[PDB]
Structures are given as structure tokens and as C-alpha cells.
Design a protein around this nucleic acid. Structure first.
Ligand SMILES: [K+]
Ligand SMILES: [Mg+2]
Ligand SMILES: [Mg+2]
Ligand SMILES: [Mg+2]
Ligand SMILES: [Mg+2]
Ligand SMILES: [Mg+2]
Ligand SMILES: [Mg+2]
Lengths: 93, 273, 63, 86, 118
RNA sequence: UGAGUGCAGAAGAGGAAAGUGGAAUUCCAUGUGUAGCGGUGAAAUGCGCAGAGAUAUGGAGGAACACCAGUGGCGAAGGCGACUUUCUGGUCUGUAACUGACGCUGAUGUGCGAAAGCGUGGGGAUCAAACAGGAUUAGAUACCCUGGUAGUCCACGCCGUAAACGAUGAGUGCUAAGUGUUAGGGGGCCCCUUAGUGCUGCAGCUAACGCAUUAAGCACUCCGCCUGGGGAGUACG
């Protein structure tokens, strides 16, 4: 089961904790009986509409192969808490 | 959920009660019990100040941690027990240093399940955090209003509160009863609803089943005499006979607010009701 | 007229290719109809899914 | 279910190797299916659209099973004791 | 009493029984409005193109005292008052920097009211 | 050959639990600023100088998901429309490995069944029975207007109805054509063919209207139902 995870990180995080955050989330998606076919990053791109009085934000794709869904569920769960994160979507492909 | 007893007699005719299926041990922990004699509304003066108490089954007090100061350590739920001292069910949590303490058990807490505490904790149910590290919207219980004292604002069954926002040093909380209140962000809380969510759907069926609890009967004012109650007196049944329904000690009771107004929380309270 | 996807041989539309999707949109962010674009129904339905996903992820506007 | 479990079970009930269409094979598959759908329903008990397919599967099973009973009671009795459905 | 704001917005709300034309900053702060009811129009006159012109003129002449030359136009609602109001705004000695016919159209939201039978 | 399985493919608002999002309405608080707003065939009640409405910012909360959208699709029907994940059913095409009539219909029975309604417990923005007021009118316990409780919303139960309509029972087969569309397949943009979905139309049928390869035709099988109108879908059970 090959999934595809993309999320958004608020622009006002410093690069170090931003790298740390992305290591955290890749390690989450991988370290629950999965692997990562690719782990990608675009850049601080523009948004079509504002979030919480943010205008632009980072994007990060994490194309995952897995099964049993636990990793993706925990991703959604923790991304809910993390205010460093704004959006998240998973798409089975 | 609820046991509906069949109607043999007229005392079990409309009764219900609880399955008691959340409950795994009955025999408590001897080490944490304390005595609890009935006082029955009887003051220091010996006098009956508060009515409609007394004459109930005896109880023994299960000593509970509303503080959760044991942080960093992780716990393991052992048993979910009964507490007569309250409406909720409790849990014997075993810390890895080998200590046993009771807590208010939430909705969805299972045996063998882990319970952390502190600021560095996960956000899972049963875990105890301060309202800083608790994010917005999450549903919580057992809030303390003074850091170090212990949880006082969500302790009954099925009860919970909601975190809304932050005013810097303070935190907005949407209590049950609909009343919003700033609370200080060092103060701890737990994630979830308190359990025994069907405690309110219990029809008691009998007068005895209330006397077992310690509830003497309420006599009404329209039957007392004028020496005893201002609603009282009258030839035949009589109505109230006043602009306002009054209490026994001669205060109005219907609609009249009874709150002190130079109190220190009056600014901490954003919305009421 | 003609279908763009059938024309180009592409058979599976991605929720991330705004430089492919933004020409199936009006000025106001609205999804264009099929009589206008000349697409097939299969690919039009794909467009709905991909576009609305892209809008969720802010890759395109609702308006 | 999937082709994996499907093959895994029809291998051991097929009367021979190229057979994949005998009543025994079908009803074994069906029993697997109805058990799966029941375990779905015990959670999502309000999916009547799926209970419908369950009922169709049961009827088709019983029809095959009556036919096999008519044909060879020995295979009937053996299959039902192997599956535990009576 | 004095205010010196050079550029602003004009918000033209028009309906089938009234128009209102208010003149604000580029930050949502009011300087002036006018309304057919302010001018005294009562009935099927408030609906008209005429009262629309007269209200736009009155509010623009109330607002140029605060020193306004350019102004952004912001239309809301249906009704045959908006075009006349805007032409009148050109006649009121003010320059027109943008029209926006934005109208709150929901995404299949709250349930509207029942149908009138007359 | 029919009916079913398998293998390779396709589509899909089919269903169920959770999760995310944006536009709008309402409400609140603050700023600006002042004379009405709203509504009408026309007016008034209502709100408003205690600063409304407009406007900007922000928040709370509930409901429904604009454009795509289509005589389009799916579902046994009822019904299903944002997006996502998890679970899940059924159908179509091609093949011709596989079983070899296993099929059809189906009384009693069982179970699903719009909307309203009921019970419990939550929720509660909009809309809105009843209710109040204004207006209209000979009168108006109506239309129209301002408001507004149940209710609409969620879960677990119950009811078990509808112009629940295609007013057309299910299954199978034969009977001219033409043209659009949906998901497929084979051949060389065109042809041919499956299963659906619309229009026009010959034979035939029909009391006429009209149906006409999605029959209301030709025929067979099974089920239910009608036997003048009212009383009466009443009464007793
Ligand atoms: K219908
Ligand atoms: Mg007496
Ligand atoms: Mg007295
Ligand atoms: Mg008397
Ligand atoms: Mg009296
Ligand atoms: Mg009304
Ligand atoms: Mg056809």
C-alpha cells in the first residue's frame, strides 16, 4: 500500500527546528512497519489563501509504502497537536 | 450500559441501575484506605446546619492523587474500582518505581494501559499536563486552579472541559455549565472525559435506595407552619402567597443571585452561565 | 472540440500540477465546465478530485 | 478478501488441480466471505447495503449445498464437518 | 474636526428596496454615508436609480471635505442602483480606481426562507 | 448454450466510523461614524441616538457542501453530491481454464424502508408548524410583514406510511430502423459488438391518448390484485 503524505510547515520556524521537525515526521512515517520511497521538499511557497494570518508556507512530500495504517494515523494525530504544522493530506495511489 | 430490572414489585417497577461492567476488582487496596465517619450536616457546634443528610451506608475513604506530581515516570493501570465517595470510577495506577495510587479513571481507560505525567508527556488520555503544553480544543478534566493544590474543576462522572485559547499567562477554559474562565497555565489537567458516563440515567426506584446513600427526606414549606417557614401556614392547601418564593431562613430562592461581587475571579471570568 | 488529456496521452491527474490545472479554471477560481474545456467525463471527474484536493492544500484558491 | 487467501483455501478443497469451480470450492469461499462481512458488521452494524450481499451469499451457498446434498451425501457431510456450519 | 485622507473605499450596497453608499478608508473606517432614506425617499423611490445617484453624490460631497480624490468601489447586492450610483460618483468630482462586484454567495449553506406567494 | 466460480480489466454522489477544509448566515467584543435600517402593492408592528444598519478586524458555534453538475452515474427500492483515510457490498466487459441445470417465481415469514412523529441524552446557527403583533379585508383565528417554541442536526431505539410514480410486478426469448450519451472490448478517425441511458419512428397493439428492442407488441412460467358509486378505508373483532 503506497501512500503519499504532504504537509505544510509554518514559515516562522527557524531552519534548525524545521529540519528537526521533518526528521521527526519522516521517522514517524518510517518507524512503524514502513519505509519511505522518497522524502522531498519544495520550499517556502506562496499560498492561495491565508491560514491564521500566514500568507506563505513550506511544503514537504513524504511518499510512503507501508501497510496496516498505524504510522499514517499517528502522523495525523500528532500533526493535529503540532501548531508548527498547518495542513496535512494523505492520498493512496 | 444500564440494567432495567423487571417490575415484580412496585419498588422495582421503574427502577434502573448500572451493569458495573467497567469494574475489574472489588476488593480495594488496604494501603490507601482511610476512615470516613458520617457527620450528617452536624457542625462543630453539634448543630444541623445542612439538611437532608444522614442515615446512610458506611464508607471508607479511598485516597486519591489529584496532583500528579510524580512526573516523568510512567504508570500502568492495574484495576478500575468503585468509589462510593463520588460518582466516578477510579483506577489503581502502578508507577514503575512500584507505587500504587488512585486516580479518576476516564472514558476509554483500559487495564494494562500506560499513564504518564508532566510537561514532556504525550497527549493521550489519562496523562497529566499543564495548560501550556495542552493544545487548543482538546477535552480535559481534573483542572487545578492553584498550581500545587490539586484538581478541582472536573471530577464528576462524564464531566470534561475544553481548552479554547490563551491570553498569555492565562488560559481560557469552557467549563461544563457553559461558563468560560481564564485559568493559569502552570496548572495541570488530564485529557479526557471522566468515566461512568451513564451515572445520570439511573432511576432510583425507591426511597430506601436514597436513604442508603444518606439522603433524609425533603419536607416542603407549604406544609410547614408559619413558625418554621414563610411559605408555610394556611387553611387548606394554600399557595405561596408572596411576590417571591422564599427559603426557610427567609431569603428568596427563585431567580435571585447569591454571589459575592468584589471577588477576585470576577475579572478572570469572561463569560458566565 | 478536443480533449486535452486524450490529446497528450496522460491518463492520471495529479493534485499538485497547478501549471496543468490552472487553465481549467476561470478568473474567479471556478471549475470550468466540460462544454468549454472539451474534456471527457472521466478526466473531468478526475479534475474535480485533483482540483479540490489542491484547494485543500492551498495550491489553488477557492476564489 | 484477496486472491491470496482465496487461492490458499481453494487449493485444499478443490477435488482436483485445475478445478476452481466446484460447489465445494465455491461454498468454502462463500463461508470465508460471510464471516468477513459479519466481522465487519459487528463493528459497523448499520450497513444494511452490505448485509444484503451477505444474504445473497448465504442463499447461493445453501443452493449449492442442497445440490451437493442431492448429488453425494458423503461429500456434503464431509464438507459441512470440515467447515462447521450446521 | 479635521481629517486628511487622500484615498479610500466606497461601499455600494444595493437591494430591491434600498441602496446605501458609504465611504471609508482603505482600512474600514467610516467618513460618511448616504441613503435614500437619509434623503427622504420613501417607497418605490428608494429602489430607483435616481436616489442612488443622489446618495452617492451626497456622500461623496460629505467626504471630499475630508480631502478625497481617488476611491475604490465595492458593490454588494442586486438592484438597478449600482450603475447610476457609480456614474454619479464619477460626476461627484472623484476618480474611480477599481470596481469589485463581490457579493456574498454561499457554498450551499444556510437554508433560505420560504417563497413569497404574492 | 442458461446459471455460478476463476483469471485479466473498467467505472461509480453504493453504504458505515473517524478526520480535515473553505464560502456564507447568526451572535458577541473592539475601532470608525451618524440618522435611520428593514420591509411593503402601499404602510405599519420590530430594531435604533443606551449609537443601530453600513464598514473592518477577530472570535464562538451549528448546519449544508456553490462552480464541477450532465435525459450523467450508483443503489433492490427508499435514497446517495465538499475532500480524505479505514472497513465493506454489488454491477459491466473479455476470456474461455472450472462445476455441469445447481435455474426462475415465491404465499406464509423475515428485514430494509422519504418526510413528519414519538422516547432517552446531547446540541442548537439558519429556516420554521403552533403562538404573539402589524397590515389587508365586509370579516381574515389566511395569503403579505416583523419576530418566534417544538422541530429541523447527532447517536441508540420505535413507527412503518407517501402522487413510496415509470401510477406500468419479476424472469426468459423473438420482432424494422435512425440518432445522442455512459463504462468497456475487437478490427481497419471510421466500422462492428456487449450492459445501461434518452429522443424520433414502421409493423403490431390501444377506447383514444399513446407504447414501440428500456413495449403498453408477440408468447410462456410464478406471485399479488379488480369486479358499479357512496356508506367506507368507516365500524365490531
Ligand atoms: K419516490
Ligand atoms: Mg400543617
Ligand atoms: Mg414568617
Ligand atoms: Mg382554599
Ligand atoms: Mg401562605
Ligand atoms: Mg412568517
Ligand atoms: Mg440501448
Amino acid at each position: 500500500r503506497t501512500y503519499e503524505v504532504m504537509y505544510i510547515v509554518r514559515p516562522n520556524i527557524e531552519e534548525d527546528a524545521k529540519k528537526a521537525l521533518v526528521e521527526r515526521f519522516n521517522g514517524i512515517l518510517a518507524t512503524e512497519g514502513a519505509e519511505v520511497l522518497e522524502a522531498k521538499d519544495w520550499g517556502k511557497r506562496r499560498l492561495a489563501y491565508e491560514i491564521n494570518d500566514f500568507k506563505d508556507g513550506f511544503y514537504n512530500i513524504v511518499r510512503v509504502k507501508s501497510d496496516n495504517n498505524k504510522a499514517t494515523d499517528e502522523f495525523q494525530r500528532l500533526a493535529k497537536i503540532s501548531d508548527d504544522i498547518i495542513r496535512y493530506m494523505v492520498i493512496r495511489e | 450500559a444500564i440494567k432495567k430490572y423487571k417490575p415484580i414489585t412496585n419498588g422495582r417497577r421503574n427502577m434502573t441501575s448500572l451493569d458495573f461492567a467497567e469494574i475489574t476488582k472489588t476488593t480495594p487496596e488496604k494501603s490507601l484506605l482511610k476512615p470516613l465517619p458520617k457527620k450528617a450536616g452536624r457542625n462543630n457546634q453539634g448543630k444541623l446546619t445542612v439538611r437532608h443528610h444522614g442515615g446512610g451506608h458506611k464508607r471508607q475513604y479511598r485516597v486519591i492523587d489529584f496532583k500528579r506530581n510524580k512526573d516523568g515516570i510512567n504508570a500502568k493501570v492495574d484495576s478500575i474500582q468503585y468509589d462510593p465517595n463520588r460518582s466516578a470510577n477510579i483506577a489503581l495506577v502502578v508507577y514503575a518505581d512500584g507505587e500504587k495510587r488512585y486516580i479518576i479513571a476516564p472514558k476509554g481507560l483500559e487495564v494494562g494501559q500506560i499513564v504518564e505525567s508532566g510537561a514532556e508527556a504525550d497527549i493521550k488520555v489519562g496523562n497529566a499536563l499543564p495548560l501550556q503544553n495542552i493544545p487548543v480544543g482538546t477535552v480535559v478534566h481534573n483542572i487545578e486552579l492553584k498550581p500545587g493544590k490539586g484538581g478541582q474543576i472536573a471530577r464528576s462522572a462524564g464531566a470534561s472541559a475544553q481548552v479554547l485559547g490563551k491570553e498569555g499567562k492565562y488560559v481560557l477554559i469552557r467549563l461544563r455549565s457553559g461558563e468560560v474562565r481564564m485559568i493559569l497555565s502552570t496548572c495541570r489537567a488530564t485529557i479526557g472525559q471522566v468515566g461512568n458516563l451513564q451515572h445520570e440515567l439511573v432511576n432510583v426506584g425507591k426511597a430506601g435506595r436514597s436513604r442508603w446513600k444518606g439522603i433524609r427526606p425533603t419536607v416542603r414549606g407549604s406544609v410547614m407552619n408559619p413558625n418554621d417557614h414563610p411559605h408555610g401556614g394556611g387553611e387548606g392547601r394554600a399557595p405561596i402567597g408572596r411576590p417571591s418564593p422564599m427559603s426557610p431562613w427567609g431569603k428568596p430562592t427563585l431567580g435571585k443571585k447569591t454571589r459575592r461581587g468584589k471577588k477576585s475571579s470576577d475579572k478572570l471570568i469572561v463569560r458566565g452561565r | 472540440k478536443v480533449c486535452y488529456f486524450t490529446a497528450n496521452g496522460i491518463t492520471h491527474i495529479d493534485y499538485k500540477d497547478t501549471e496543468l490545472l490552472k487553465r481549467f479554471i476561470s478568473e474567479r477560481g471556478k471549475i470550468l465546465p466540460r462544454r468549454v474545456t472539451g474534456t471527457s467525463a472521466k478526466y473531468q471527474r478526475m479534475l474535480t478530485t485533483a482540483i479540490k484536493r489542491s484547494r485543500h492544500m492551498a495550491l489553488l484558491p477557492y476564489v | 478478501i484477496s486472491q491470496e487467501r482465496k487461492n490458499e483455501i481453494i487449493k485444499e478443497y478443490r477435488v482436483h488441480e485445475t478445478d476452481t469451480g466446484s460447489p465445494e470450492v465455491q461454498i468454502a469461499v462463500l463461508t470465508a466471505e460471510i464471516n468477513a462481512v459479519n466481522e465487519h458488521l459487528r463493528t459497523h452494524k448499520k450497513d444494511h447495503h452490505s448485509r444484503r450481499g451477505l444474504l445473497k451469499m448465504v442463499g447461493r451457498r445453501r443452493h449449492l449445498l442442497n445440490y451437493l446434498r442431492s448429488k453425494d451425501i458423503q461429500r456434503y457431510r464431509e464438507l459441512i464437518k470440515s467447515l462447521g456450519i450446521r | 474636526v479635521k481629517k486628511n485622507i487622500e484615498n479610500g473605499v466606497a461601499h455600494i450596497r444595493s437591494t430591491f428596496n434600498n441602496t446605501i453608499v458609504t465611504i471609508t478608508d482603505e482600512f474600514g473606517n467610516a467618513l460618511s454615508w448616504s441613503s435614500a432614506g437619509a434623503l427622504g425617499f420613501k417607497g418605490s423611490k428608494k429602489s430607483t436609480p435616481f436616489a442612488a445617484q443622489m446618495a452617492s453624490e451626497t456622500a461623496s460631497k460629505s467626504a471630499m471635505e475630508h480631502g478625497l480624490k481617488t476611491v475604490e468601489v465595492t458593490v454588494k447586492g442586486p438592484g438597478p442602483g449600482r450603475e447610476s450610483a457609480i456614474r454619479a460618483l464619477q460626476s461627484a468630482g472623484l476618480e474611480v480606481t477599481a470596481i469589485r462586484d463581490v457579493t456574498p454567495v454561499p457554498h450551499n449553506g444556510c437554508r433560505p426562507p420560504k417563497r413569497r406567494r404574492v
